[PDB]
């Protein structure tokens, strides 16, 4: 067979430097273990400094922090500060009462 | 001797399903691999049973005739092998692989 | 910012049931492929010849092949050896 699963091969980006270890399975496993959504902050409005309560009439943004059934995600998952989690939950509950979410 | 080893290698089943009394529930029929010594025992017993249906009073003569027929293609024990392999193909998913 | 959770002082640092990886037997997988090969191309089909030859060699002496059929975890040995050093406990 001339095919390998993507999970068993690492694609080295262009312009990057590499070591011989980058072709091993240890690199594959190490990349899975340390795979965190750290790029969310730059794409996370609520981690930028905006007040989440200003989005109470914008269900599309709020729908990014609820599960498929509408259950607000725990702070352990959202990664927000206590204040933003507190404000975001208020926004979602207000949005639900207005008839938008 | 070469004829005997060829017949034993063609008649013996590669795998055989065995019932394992795993759990209080019904036992599982899982295909198991067979080694060469275990394969020869299964094939030899089939040959002996086939041989003892022949007319000669001497076991050597009946065995000789049976071995000659197997070396010439004709044997009723190839059906047994096909039925042991069919069962194993059916239970291929029951294998554990760890 | 990621919340660090610090444990209280503990009588031990131990994993109840350490997870050990157990590699699959090469003879069992060879058998699992041959059985599938017969399921598609048919029993004794000439396409599964190599599978049959490989299975016979794998199982010739031991039906499960010669294997390093042992593996134990050492996490509890190291966890008990290093706990006092790394727990960050204040001085006496």
């Amino acid at each position: 067979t001339k095919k390998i699963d993507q999970s068993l091969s690492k694609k080295l980006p262009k312009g990057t430097i590499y070591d011989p270890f980058d072709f091993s399975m240890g690199r594959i496993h190490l990349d899975r273990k340390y795979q965190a959504n750290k790029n969310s902050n730059r794409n996370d409005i609520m981690k930028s400094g905006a007040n989440p309560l200003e989005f109470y009439a914008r269900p599309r943004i709020l729908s990014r922090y609820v599960t498929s059934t509408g259950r607000i995600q725990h702070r352990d998952i959202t990664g927000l500060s206590a204040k933003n989690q507190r404000r975001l939950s208020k926004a979602i509950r207000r949005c639900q009462a207005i008839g938008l979410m | 001797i070469q004829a005997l080893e060829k017949s034993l290698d063609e008649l013996a089943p590669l795998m055989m399903t065995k019932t394992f009394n795993t759990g209080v529930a019904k036992a599982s029929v899982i295909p198991v691999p067979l080694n060469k010594r275990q394969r020869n025992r299964i094939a030899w017993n089939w040959i002996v049973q086939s041989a003892n249906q022949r007319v000669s009073s001497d076991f050597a003569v009946r065995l000789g005739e049976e071995l000659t027929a197997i070396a010439k293609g004709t044997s009723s024990a190839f059906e047994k092998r096909d039925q042991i392999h069919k069962t194993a193909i059916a239970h291929r998913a029951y294998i554990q692989l760890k | 910012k990621p919340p660090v959770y610090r444990l209280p002082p503990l009588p031990r640092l131990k994993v109840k049931k350490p997870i050990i990886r157990q590699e699959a037997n090469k003879c069992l997988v060879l058998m699992s492929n041959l059985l599938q090969c017969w399921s598609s191309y048919g029993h004794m089909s000439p396409k599964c010849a190599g599978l049959v030859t490989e299975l016979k060699s794998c199982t010739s002496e031991s039906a499960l092949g010669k294997r390093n059929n042992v593996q134990k975890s050492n996490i509890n040995y190291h966890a008990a050896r290093l706990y006092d050093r790394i727990n960050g406990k204040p001085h006496d």
């Binding site: 390998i4 699963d5 068993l8 091993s24 | - | -």
Partner: peptide, 25 residues
């Protein structure tokens, strides 16, 4: 790199055969 890529070849083949059998289930 060859030393590493040789061990990687073996494991890939092994893990591309356990998957095929395990998926057959």
């Amino acid at each position: 790199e060859q030393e590493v890529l040789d061990v990687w070849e073996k494991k890939v083949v092994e893990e591309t055969e356990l998957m095929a059998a395990r998926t057959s289930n």
